[PDB]
Structure 1
Amino acid sequence: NGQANAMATVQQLDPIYVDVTQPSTALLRLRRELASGQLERAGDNAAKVSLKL
């Protein structure tokens, strides 16, 4: 009862999460550009674009 190692595994493939990484320097640079530098905001059309395998 309650052993660590599993005996089998089930998973769902529809949909699929994908988690990417981003350095914090680009995030703070985008924050300092988004409000005082080159002012820009796309909107809900900037929800998501595609990925590459």
Structure 2
Amino acid sequence: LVTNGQANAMATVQQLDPIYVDVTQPSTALLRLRRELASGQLERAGDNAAK
């Protein structure tokens, strides 16, 4: 038996032509990245923050 608006699934379809990747960086590394990238040493250009 199956009912309207239930919570348990009954099949699973999924597409795979691109596939996402959910990576995690810590929030301390955001500050260590941004404080040195804004003023001091390094900068982003080209395909740097893309590929």
TM-score normalised to the size of structure 2?
0.77
| Structure 1: gaps of 5 or more residues | 48-53
User: Partners in 1 of 2:20 and 2:34 — Cα distance?
Assistant: 26
Runs of 4+ in structure 1 deviating by more than 6 angstroms, as ranges, are none
User: Identity over the aligned pairs, expressed in percent?
Assistant: 100
Kindly tell me the number of residue pairs found equivalent between the two proteins.
47
Report whether the alignment pairs 1:19 with 2:27: no
Shift of 1:45: 4.2
Shift of 1:44: 3.3
**RMSD of Structure 2 on Structure 1 (CA):** 1.4
Shift of 1:21: 0.3
Give the greater-gyration-radius structure (CA): 2
| Structure 2: gaps of 5 or more residues | none
TM-score normalised to the size of structure 1?
0.75
